[PDB]
Scaffold this active site. Structure first.
Site, short mmCIF file in Angstrom:
data_model
loop_
_atom_site.label_atom_id
_atom_site.label_comp_id
_atom_site.label_asym_id
_atom_site.label_seq_id
_atom_site.Cartn_x
_atom_site.Cartn_y
_atom_site.Cartn_z
N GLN E 105 0.83 -1.20 0.00
CA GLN E 105 0.00 0.00 0.00
C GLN E 105 0.87 1.25 0.00
O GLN E 105 1.98 1.25 0.52
CB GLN E 105 -0.93 0.02 1.21
CG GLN E 105 -2.17 -0.85 1.06
CD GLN E 105 -3.04 -0.84 2.30
OE1 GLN E 105 -4.08 -0.19 2.33
NE2 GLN E 105 -2.62 -1.56 3.33
N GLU E 106 0.32 2.32 -0.60
CA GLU E 106 0.93 3.65 -0.69
C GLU E 106 2.30 3.60 -1.37
O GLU E 106 3.33 3.96 -0.78
CB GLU E 106 1.02 4.32 0.69
N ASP E 107 2.29 3.12 -2.62
CA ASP E 107 3.44 3.08 -3.52
C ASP E 107 4.59 2.25 -2.95
O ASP E 107 5.74 2.68 -2.89
CB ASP E 107 3.92 4.50 -3.88
CG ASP E 107 2.81 5.36 -4.45
OD1 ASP E 107 1.68 4.84 -4.63
OD2 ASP E 107 3.05 6.55 -4.72
N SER E 108 4.26 1.03 -2.53
CA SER E 108 5.22 0.09 -1.98
C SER E 108 5.31 -1.14 -2.87
O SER E 108 4.47 -1.37 -3.75
CB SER E 108 4.85 -0.29 -0.54
OG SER E 108 5.78 -1.22 0.00
N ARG F 28 -0.17 8.19 -10.99
CA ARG F 28 1.13 8.54 -11.54
C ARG F 28 1.05 8.76 -13.05
O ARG F 28 1.90 9.45 -13.63
CB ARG F 28 2.15 7.45 -11.22
CG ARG F 28 2.56 7.39 -9.76
CD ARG F 28 4.01 6.95 -9.62
NE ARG F 28 4.57 7.31 -8.32
CZ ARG F 28 4.80 6.45 -7.34
NH1 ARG F 28 4.51 5.16 -7.51
NH2 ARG F 28 5.31 6.86 -6.19
#
Ligand SMILES: [Mg+2]
Ligand SMILES: [Zn+2]
Ligand SMILES: [Zn+2]
Lengths: 142, 189, 97, 62, 123, 118, 289
Positions: E105-108, F28
């Site tokens: 989660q959250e760009d992981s 993005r």
């Protein structure tokens, strides 16, 4: 026993399709008792078409005069329960509303889990239904 | 969400107290179980994240998955409440086991006695069980009226044990379905 | 020492919560589906609370016909005797070739 | 550096099938056809043989 | 050029309008304008990969090198006429978009334990 | 760092070693990574049967269309859009939705973990 | 309530490519066996090395990682003890119960560059030898470069490191059964059936060249692409082909990578699944009586 029994006919479908991974709002109306059905049922596991014949019942229990309540969540087979139908549902009633303008304007709001069903008609037939009651939906296509 | 940071490389400063007068005051005015009200806006502070919001959307919008009693009792362990009765006894003559309802699975988070009504999404919660849903997503995130604020106004004692079970069960539910962005999603045709 | 621990819940009659140490998903998925085959088990499920630790939690809520302790050996031996029947079927088939 | 002995995902040993890959690439075979003669059906164990730099022939001069 | 007989000049190639760190990125026009600018001069400058072939004469601090560098599967036209396979750093990986228990989660990114022990991404 | 048996495994035997979040795609705004993952997959997988008519250029300003990748990946046994039916690693049952897969090109940066603890 | 009875049928059986069926069982018997056969069955691999002199181009820690991934054979794999279970011998030597020794020694003195191979590792015990084509290359030595080390291999579980796992690709599929509605096949024309055949990614549906009928040939190679069902869905015949997977009758495609035999892999898996389910019921037997 049965509190309300009728034979309906499919009038129109709201999505009017096939394999839509949704629920169809099958609108139906009676011919002998002047009722109106708005039951949601998916066509993928139970195929219904525009124009058919199917009976519908509504009983507060399925023990067939052997127990006045439902019981546990997973009900086992005991003493030849009512399994003559094909489409059995379960739900709780939550709203009884009326309307003016016409005599047959008493509706009936019930929710079988996440689905909905509207039963608009005269107040003489749906007078046996209380508020916050655990009902059943016995159905069979013929 | 109060930190306003992601996991792309952000660091976290850590201060450790030593005195008792700086230790008792931390779990009384500073800790997370005390500042549950975002006083800048006047509403809830800890809303749903990214995966939990999408899972709570898909559970109540999909409406055409009938999971049986085998994969239902496994998801009843992450939630502190019991199992509801099955809303479907027999959906087909080729089906024997009583299958549950997707919207009935979301009733394992609301306590018995919870009353909530949102008119813009037509959702009614009567006695700890939601009964209606028609094309809505505003009652889940940080809006005007949502179930997180109505749970914080109900008891305010186990909200952190409710959002935790609303994530550790919804993640295991979304793992059973799978969310993936393929080329047909960019093609849109 | 004390790999298997017995914890009996109080709020639900005829209910237990079994837990073991240093295991994985190879047992919590092979015991749950064996308990689901029986007709006296109304609740069966495994749960890994923390994957950094190694401890699964199995909850069994049975009926009044049998104890939740006697419904564990009947699910362990049902696999311990099925693996012998699988081995006796594979050892003849590998000897045929 | 050199070709790895095992695949990074599958685990099939591919450290020995490097000299016989350049020996079949010396002919007029295609890179997509020189891997079918070494019994590689998945695209996990084919990207190791297809895309690998030979840095030891540049590192052995000194 | 073949259809109109009005042109008097022509470009050699449309890919030869960017820098050497940007004209080798595949699908450089499909990306966002602030997402190839965030990689052409911000990620390739600090990506470990190839190094100097003579580590016995060059002595400087922070000289990192990958064990198994790999050229990519594709072959751009800016990497074919240059005749150089040193400007591509990093290894290949079969990725899959999936919600994996909320741990990414959250760009992981969640990774494999049985792949970092076989030589992948070791430096 | 999950172990190998717990990942969703495919019918052929491939295991995804890097799993990224699908929520980072419409924010993005990076398309062409799913195109790179579909162009690197069609040139690595073997054709059943033509190892010369396939396109593997991926030029920045001369990109091949979607109708050329979705018809080159179809001629080898995989699906058109790149996704494939995956199973479960913990339970073992099938998933209701397919998962897109492809051999992308990931780089490792300088900023490690031990160089930032203080 | 009671146990089941699984039925098998081996199609082909050779070295490291054993293929057998598994019928009348659920998915948690074909998954909880794959998860043991891919990571739990122990083999031997080189763990501790001791490099005396290294004058090659590669570093002295790049070779110790490559030498541990060599697929050593293991016939006495289950009959030996671990390093922690064996409190004796203090490590560092051929204990012949928990370790084994290796001796690598090579030197390039000629003009041409010679490379060492996996067939150069000489062990003191001739029952633990690297398998062998050319072989696994390690280094390449110039005129004047030598390499000499001493390795120690021990039995280890493949859950710790990815060098002890003897199964590269062990998977299984559901082996579905497909049905064709013959009452709706005559609705479509010849070109629609041709366009429906060519829409499949794999060779699943064929054609009879004497009557133009859609005949099922090799149904085990469908791979669940869901491209034949969606093709007839967006056509003039919905629900023509209904595909549903079976709950039983799986097939296994195992691989044993040359370390152990493919027949001994699924035997050592079910011989350890009988002892993993053994210490659970005897440690919970005193709380029952
Ligand atoms: Mg950040
Ligand atoms: Zn591979
Ligand atoms: Zn020893």
């Amino acid at each position: 026993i049965i509190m309300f029994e009728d034979i309906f006919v499919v009038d129109k479908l709201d999505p009017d399709g096939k394999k839509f991974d949704k629920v169809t709002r099958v609108e139906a109306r009676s011919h002998n008792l002047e009722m109106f059905m708005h039951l949601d049922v998916n066509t993928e596991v139970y195929p219904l078409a525009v124009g058919d014949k199917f009976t519908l019942a509504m009983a507060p229990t399925l023990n067939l005069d052997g127990t006045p309540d439902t019981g546990y969540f997973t009900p086992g087979a005991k003493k030849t329960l009512a399994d003559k139908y094909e489409y059995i549902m379960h739900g709780k009633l939550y709203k009884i509303s009326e309307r003016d303008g016409k005599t047959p304007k008493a509706e009936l709001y019930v929710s079988f889990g996440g689905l909905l069903m509207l039963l608009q008609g005269d107040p003489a037939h749906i007078s046996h239904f209380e508020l916050d009651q655990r009902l059943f939906l016995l159905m069979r296509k013929l | 969400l109060p930190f306003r940071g992601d996991f792309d490389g952000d660091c976290l400063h850590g201060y450790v107290p030593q005195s008792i007068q700086a230790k008792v005051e931390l779990d009384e005015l500073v800790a997370l179980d005390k500042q549950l009200i975002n006083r800048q806006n006047g509403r809830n502070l800890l809303s749903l994240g990214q995966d939990s919001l999408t899972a709570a959307y898909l559970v109540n919008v999909e409406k055409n998955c009938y999971l049986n009693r085998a994969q239902m009792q496994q998801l009843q362990m992450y939630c502190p409440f019991q199992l509801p009765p099955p809303a479907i006894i027999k959906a087909s003559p080729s089906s024997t086991e009583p299958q549950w309802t997707g919207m009935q699975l979301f009733g394992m988070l609301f306590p018995p006695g919870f009353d909530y009504t949102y008119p813009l999404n037509n959702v009614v919660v009567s006695n700890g069980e939601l009964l209606s849903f028609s094309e809505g997503s505003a009652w889940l995130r940080d809006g005007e009226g949502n179930f997180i604020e109505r749970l914080l106004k109900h008891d305010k004692g186990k909200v952190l044990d409710i959002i935790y079970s609303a994530q550790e069960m919804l993640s295991q539910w979304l793992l059973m379905r799978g969310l993936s962005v393929s080329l047909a999603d960019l093609y849109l045709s | 020492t004390k790999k298997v621990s017995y914890d009996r819940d109080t709020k639900i009659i005829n209910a237990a919560s079994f837990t073991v140490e240093r295991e994985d998903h190879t047992i919590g998925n092979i015991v749950r589906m064996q308990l689901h085959r029986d007709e006296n088990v109304l609740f069966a499920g495994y749960q890994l609370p923390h994957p950094l630790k190694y401890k699964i939690i199995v909850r069994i809520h049975t009926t009044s016909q049998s104890s939740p302790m006697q419904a564990y050996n009947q699910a362990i031996n049902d696999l311990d005797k099925e693996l012998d029947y699988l081995k006796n079927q594979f050892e003849a088939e590998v000897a045929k070739f | 550096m050199i070709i790895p002995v095992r695949c990074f995902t599958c685990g099939k040993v591919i450290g020995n099938k490097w000299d016989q890959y350049l020996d079949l690439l010396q002919l007029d075979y295609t890179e997509g056809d020189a891997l079918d003669a070494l019994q590689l059906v998945r695209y996990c164990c084919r990207r190791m043989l297809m895309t690998h730099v030979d840095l030891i022939e540049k590192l052995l001069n000194y | 050029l073949k259809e109109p007989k009005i042109y008097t000049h022509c470009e050699l190639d449309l890919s030869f309008l960017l820098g050497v760190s940007c004209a080798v990125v595949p699908f450089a026009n499909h990306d966002h304008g602030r997402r190839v600018l965030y990689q052409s001069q911000k990620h390739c400058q600090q990506a470990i990969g190839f190094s100097s072939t003579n580590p016995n004469i060059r002595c400087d601090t922070l000289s990192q090198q990958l064990f198994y560098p790999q050229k990519p599967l594709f072959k751009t036209l800016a990497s074919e006429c240059l005749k150089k396979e040193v400007l591509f750093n990093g290894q290949n990986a079969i990725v899959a978009v999936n919600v994996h228990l909320g741990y990414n989660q959250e760009d992981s990114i969640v990774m494999n334990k049985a792949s970092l022990e076989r030589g992948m991404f070791r430096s | 760092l999950e172990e190998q048996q717990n990942f969703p495994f495919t019918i052929q035997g491939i295991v995804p070693d890097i799993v990224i979040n699908p929520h980072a795609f419409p924010s993005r705004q990076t398309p062409g990574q799913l195109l790179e993952a579909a162009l690197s997959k069609g040139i690595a997988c073997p054709i059943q049967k033509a190892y010369t008519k396939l396109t593997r250029h991926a030029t920045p300003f001369s990109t091949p269309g979607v109708t050329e990748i979705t018809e080159q990946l179809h001629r080898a046994g995989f699906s058109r859009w790149g996704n494939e039916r995956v199973y479960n690693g913990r339970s073992g049952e099938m998933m209701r939705s397919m998962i897109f897969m492809g051999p992308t090109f990931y780089q490792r940066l300088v900023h490690m973990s031990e160089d930032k603890v203080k | 309530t009671y146990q089941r009875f699984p039925k098998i049928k081996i199609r082909e059986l050779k070295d490291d490519y054993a293929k057998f069926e598994l019928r009348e069982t659920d998915v948690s018997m074909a998954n909880a066996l794959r998860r043991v056969m891919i990571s739990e069955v122990p083999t031997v691999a080189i763990d501790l090395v001791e490099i005396e002199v290294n004058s090659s181009v590669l570093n002295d820690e790049f070779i110790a990682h490559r030498l541990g991934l060599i697929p050593l054979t293991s016939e006495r794999a289950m009959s030996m003890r671990f390093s922690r279970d064996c409190d004796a011998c203090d490590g560092d030597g051929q204990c012949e119960f928990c370790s084994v020794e290796f001796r690598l020694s090579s030197k390039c003195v000629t003009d041409q560059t010679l490379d060492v191979t996996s067939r150069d590792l000489y062990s003191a015990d001739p029952t633990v030898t690297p398998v062998d084509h050319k072989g696994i290359i390690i280094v390449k030595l110039r005129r004047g470069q030598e390499l000499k080390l001493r390795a120690i291999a021990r039995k280890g579980i493949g859950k710790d490191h990815a060098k002890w796992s003897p199964a590269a690709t062990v998977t299984f599929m559901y082996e579905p059964d497909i049905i064709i509605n013959e009452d709706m096949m005559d609705t479509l024309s010849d070109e629609e059936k041709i366009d429906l055949i060519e829409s499949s990614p794999t060779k699943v549906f064929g054609m009879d060249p004497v009557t133009r009928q859609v005949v099922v040939v090799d149904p085990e190679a469908y791979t669940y692409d869901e491209e034949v069902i969606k093709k007839a869905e967006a056509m003039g015949k919905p629900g023509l082909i209904e595909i549903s997977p079976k709950d039983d009758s799986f097939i296994f495609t195992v691989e044993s990578t040359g370390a152990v035999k493919a027949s001994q892999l699924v035997l050592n898996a079910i011989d350890l699944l009988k002892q993993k389910l053994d210490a659970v019921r005897l440690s919970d037997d005193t709380v029952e009586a």
